[PDB]
Amino acid sequence: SSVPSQKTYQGSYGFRLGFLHSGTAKSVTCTYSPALNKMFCQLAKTCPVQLWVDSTPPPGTRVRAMAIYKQSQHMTEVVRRCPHHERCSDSDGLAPPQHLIRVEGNLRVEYLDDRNTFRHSVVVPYEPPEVGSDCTTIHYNYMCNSSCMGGMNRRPILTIITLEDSSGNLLGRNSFEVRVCACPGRDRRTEEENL
Amino acid sequence: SSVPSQKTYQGSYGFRLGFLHSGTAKSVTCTYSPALNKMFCQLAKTCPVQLWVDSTPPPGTRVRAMAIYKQSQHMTEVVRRCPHHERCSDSDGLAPPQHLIRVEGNLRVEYLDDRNTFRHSVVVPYEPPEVGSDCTTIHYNYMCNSSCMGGMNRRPILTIITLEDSSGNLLGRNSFEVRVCACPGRDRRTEEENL
Amino acid sequence: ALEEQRGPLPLNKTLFLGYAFLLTMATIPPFNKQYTESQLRAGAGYILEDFNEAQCNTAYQCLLIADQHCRTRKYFLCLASGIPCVSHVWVHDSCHANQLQNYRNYLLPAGYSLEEQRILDWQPRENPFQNLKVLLVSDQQQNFLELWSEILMTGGAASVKQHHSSAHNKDIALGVFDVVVTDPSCPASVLKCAEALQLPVVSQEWVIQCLIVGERIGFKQHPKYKHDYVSH
Amino acid sequence: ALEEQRGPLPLNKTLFLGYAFLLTMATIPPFNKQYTESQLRAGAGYILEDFNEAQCNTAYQCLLIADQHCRTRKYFLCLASGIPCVSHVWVHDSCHANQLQNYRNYLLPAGYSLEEQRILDWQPRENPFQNLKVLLVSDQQQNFLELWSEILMTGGAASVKQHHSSAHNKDIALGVFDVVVTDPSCPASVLKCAEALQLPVVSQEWVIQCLIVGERIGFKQHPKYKHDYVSH
Ligand SMILES: [Zn+2]
Ligand SMILES: [Zn+2]
């Protein structure tokens, strides 16, 4: 009955998150609202998330991504893929069909199905930024819509990004709310006005 | 519930479409009406669509054909072959029996059945014009009549022709209305007078 | 060559379970209202003998099956109540794939439109008679007063007052009404009053056409809307 | 593409054993109340024909099954009684896996909230009508007095006094009530009495909104709560 911690912890490496600009077009596949600290994106579409640090983490460091429900009444509930989509061939072989969050582009990804908590998570090795670039970029895939009956079922989620040493010890944490939908741009504008 | 886009987009290559002239005889198998930007043709008859461009697209580029209903009330519904005709041997094997649009003459033609939208599309590789010619001609086949019960069922459609790079990114878009019917030329004249 | 279209009986016994059907026809694979209804039953489809929006609202997914668009009482009730008018060919194709087909690809036309002068496709619409206050006048309970009162109401009318042409004493308030739907048996007193009260008066063709087009149309956009219009 | 969602009949004949289900629908996989019900019976699920909190309290784990949130008598009885409102997709995914799913991942929303102006998810709540003494005034046994009396009571009300609008002689003690729930058929004498006794008078919408929000809301936080509010 333990809800993973979601408190911002820049840590010793000064860990921060970065996203890409995308405006509010309806053809936009992923857009992030600084105002809401919430990413709006579509099913199975690429979601770039940027890792920024002030000091370089020693190789052997990992980056974990995990989804938890945002509402207090559901926090203890495990976030998973609805049955309908578990029964779909989109399985790239690497990712267990029950995982909401996936990583594309990286061949060293591991999937954790936590025997004690029962939560799902996807982790990859930490890699320094690319030369000529100030940040490591990981590409995430959300395999269900926020509305999926049987899955997220309309409940908003938070994605927690964790920086860990090889032994799993916390080095840093950040997080952002996510809404997987048909019109990311449209929904971003709608929600930003609602403030 | 996303309706594929139908906005003209000539793009960086200046992509335009072209059609052959074919008056209004009752023996004509496919006739285009500029006034309506509409092709009238017969079942399974060859329908030549010409591809014009100002700059030559890099090879690896693709041409995708897709039909969407024209009327707003039906745009979210997927255009497909009526069951009656799915049950007919005209299946050149290459073409899944459920596709309305086919391409003849080419041999590299692929048939997309989109796992998320559920729409059908037919895409072949882009090829530069023929020497002595100013455009690339693609031969389309429409396997049902606009009137087929359990299919288009009298609902008028639009064919959306898309120029794509090898990664699926949009490069160009154009479109024309289509009526598959018994008497192309007769109907063309009838509809042009109704203006 | 006639069984070919017809299709078989469903095989799958529960093919139409959860569906209820209403059948009609006028007065293109021949429509066999006999084989069709037997196909339906073999699939556990529920056969509605007469219109009933009770079952159509809470118990079953209701559909009207016919061979083409009709001008029968059932066709009108379905158009007025939003029940889909589907081609029997949907039944035939389904019994064939032993799988339910998408009825949305088999919608029959709504009907022939006078104003348009052509057969019109059906499309979603608001209640054409929403909150309308009607006065029905005629010398025939069944065929007119009963018939239209039920269609008007199912179509959204706020109220319908049935008033037997001759056999009825005019102790009604003609100002409360929006329209008078009547026929050639309408007493002249009612007409002269409606006129004086600026209350429009029409024939049943006005109602029918409203149902076909999907909206409340002009009380006078066509001669046939005159309640006294006669063949000729 | 329709059986796909539906799912099969449960192979495990006792999949829903120990559960009772109540089904309804309003007026996104089409909801086939018939096939869904056969799926539940095929797994020994017990089908309740109407709300009954006897069996829902002792004998079975009751669930209301529907396609979305509704404003029906049965939806209200369940929201008021804490019987969960579950999507029929839960029945289907359970048959598909031949294994009971977590219905907590299939909860239907409570309903549309006037104050929030949007659909509200359902969340745990105290009896909204805990220790409320209610006086129901109306000219209809079934539909109002019988209906709301039951809903208020299972909602934790201490007492509900039914009192037929016109056809009832005002020999009650209006001071013993907290609220008067009524419609436009409320006698002016009661309104005038309540006004002086400072006892609030509302419409059924006040009750419904409390059921949807999951808490006792303002007697006057919205116009529709005035007993006399009419469409318009
Ligand atoms: Zn899903
Ligand atoms: Zn066809």
Curated annotation (Swiss-Prot), chains A, B:
Consequence of substituting L43P: In sporadic cancers; somatic mutation
Effect of G172A: In sporadic cancers; somatic mutation
Outcome of substituting I138L: In sporadic cancers; somatic mutation
Effect of P125L: In sporadic cancers; somatic mutation
Outcome of mutating Q50R: In sporadic cancers; somatic mutation
Mutagenesis / variant outcome for changing L195P: In sporadic cancers; somatic mutation
Effect of mutating R179C: In LFS; germline mutation and in sporadic cancers; somatic mutation
Outcome, altering D113E: In sporadic cancers; somatic mutation
Outcome of mutating C47W: In sporadic cancers; somatic mutation
Effect of I160D: In sporadic cancers; somatic mutation; requires 2 nucleotide substitutions
Outcome, altering T8I: In sporadic cancers; somatic mutation
Effect of N169D: In sporadic cancers; somatic mutation
Outcome following mutation: A35V: In sporadic cancers; somatic mutation
Result when mutating T159S: In sporadic cancers; somatic mutation
Recorded consequence of changing P96H: In a sporadic cancer; somatic mutation
Reported impact of V131A: In sporadic cancers; somatic mutation
Outcome when changing P83A: In a sporadic cancer; somatic mutation
Reported impact of L163V: In sporadic cancers; somatic mutation
Effect of mutating R62G: In sporadic cancers; somatic mutation
Annotated region (Interaction with DNA), positions in chain: 179-186
Consequence of changing V123G: In sporadic cancers; somatic mutation
Outcome when changing E192V: In sporadic cancers; somatic mutation
Disease per record: TP53 is found in increased amounts in a wide variety of transformed cells. TP53 is frequently mutated or inactivated in about 60% of cancers. TP53 defects are found in Barrett metaplasia a condition in which the normally stratified squamous epithelium of the lower esophagus is replaced by a metaplastic columnar epithelium. The condition develops as a complication in approximately 10% of patients with chronic gastroesophageal reflux disease and predisposes to the development of esophageal adenocarcinoma.
Name of the protein in its database record: Cellular tumor antigen p53
The species this protein was found in: Homo sapiens
Gene that encodes it: TP53
Full-protein interval shown: 95 to 289 of 393
UniProtKB/Swiss-Prot annotation, chains C, D:
Chain positions with Phosphoserine modification: S38
Entry PTM: Asymmetrically dimethylated on Arg residues by PRMT1. Methylation is required for DNA binding.
Residues covered by the BRCT domain: 11-108, 124-224
Subcellular location: Nucleus; Chromosome; Chromosome, Centromere, Kinetochore
Assembly and interaction partners: Homoligomer. Interacts with p53/TP53 (via the central domain). Interacts with DCLRE1C. Interacts with histone H2AX and this requires phosphorylation of H2AX on 'Ser-139'. Interacts with histone H4 that has been dimethylated at 'Lys-20' (H4K20me2). Has low affinity for histone H4 containing monomethylated 'Lys-20' (H4K20me1). Does not bind histone H4 containing unmethylated or trimethylated 'Lys-20' (H4K20me3). Has low affinity for histone H3 that has been dimethylated on 'Lys-79'. Has very low affinity for histone H3 that has been monomethylated on 'Lys-79' (in vitro). (Microbial infection) Interacts (via C-terminus) with Epstein-Barr virus lytic switch protein BZLF1 (via C-terminus); this interaction is involved in the activation of the viral lytic cycle.
Biological role: Double-strand break (DSB) repair protein involved in response to DNA damage, telomere dynamics and class-switch recombination (CSR) during antibody genesis. Plays a key role in the repair of double-strand DNA breaks (DSBs) in response to DNA damage by promoting non-homologous end joining (NHEJ)-mediated repair of DSBs and specifically counteracting the function of the homologous recombination (HR) repair protein BRCA1. In response to DSBs, phosphorylation by ATM promotes interaction with RIF1 and dissociation from NUDT16L1/TIRR, leading to recruitment to DSBs sites.
Disease listed for this protein: A chromosomal aberration involving TP53BP1 is found in a form of myeloproliferative disorder chronic with eosinophilia. Translocation t(5;15)(q33;q22) with PDGFRB creating a TP53BP1-PDGFRB fusion protein.
Domain notes: The Tudor-like region mediates binding to histone H4 dimethylated at 'Lys-20' (H4K20me2). Interaction with NUDT16L1/TIRR masks the Tudor-like domain and prevents recruitment to chromatin. The UDR (ubiquitin-dependent recruitment) motif specifically recognizes and binds histone H2A monoubiquitinated at 'Lys-15' (H2AK15ub). Phosphorylation of the UDR blocks interaction with H2AK15ub.
Protein name: TP53-binding protein 1
Shown segment, full-protein numbering: 1714 to 1972 of 1972
